[PDB]
Amino acid sequence: SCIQFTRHASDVLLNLNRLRSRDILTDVVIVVSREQFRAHKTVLMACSGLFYSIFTDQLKCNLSVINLDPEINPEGFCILLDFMYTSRLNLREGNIMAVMATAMYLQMEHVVDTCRKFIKASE
């Protein structure tokens, strides 16, 4: 018999993105080649099958630094990290291949789906 506040989940996510911008309670640095990205482990796990697996691991759960595969593109990661915290995906002709490969690695199925559909439409 609950009532539901429609905008609640979006409001929570907006405030989690504000915490990320102010670097408040971030507990991990994701290293992608020469670039570093600070984030909240809980948000990373909630968005990504790869981070969900990493941070449920009894040893990796305590790491403050996670290094991604050297083939991962920093801009592609940046775009996906922004997506995680906002629901908005900056998908462009110039970045779509990098975004799709990063989303496959990060196990972000909905992003992979849409990248596949946008690529199929251009061929």
Added chain:
Amino acid sequence: SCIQFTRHASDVLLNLNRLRSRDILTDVVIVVSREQFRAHKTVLMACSGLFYSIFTDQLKCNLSVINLDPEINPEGFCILLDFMYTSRLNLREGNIMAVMATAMYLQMEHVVDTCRKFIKASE
């Protein structure tokens, strides 16, 4: 020029609630009289003006235990904590006064609004 995934914020919140149920990466215990509630500081701040103030404080940000005012009802807190993690509010005739007083203390304006409207309709 971003695209947006409509269900993303709800999916994130569902996974944050799954982490809470499994006690994964919870970093605080909220003590309400004889009861204890484990949560994620980032979610508490994102939902509550009181926790936002508490966890931005340079000393309180590092506490693992937060004790609420002894006048706060544990069930009222439990209902609001569930709301924070689900967008669903279990508002009933038997709990509405406790929920409203807890929401005022926690500074959860949207919950206070609706409690006020449900009370006004019954008088």
Added chain:
Amino acid sequence: WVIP
């Protein structure tokens, strides 16, 4: 607020 809505009835979900």
Added chain:
Amino acid sequence: WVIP
């Protein structure tokens, strides 16, 4: 997915 939508145009926001």
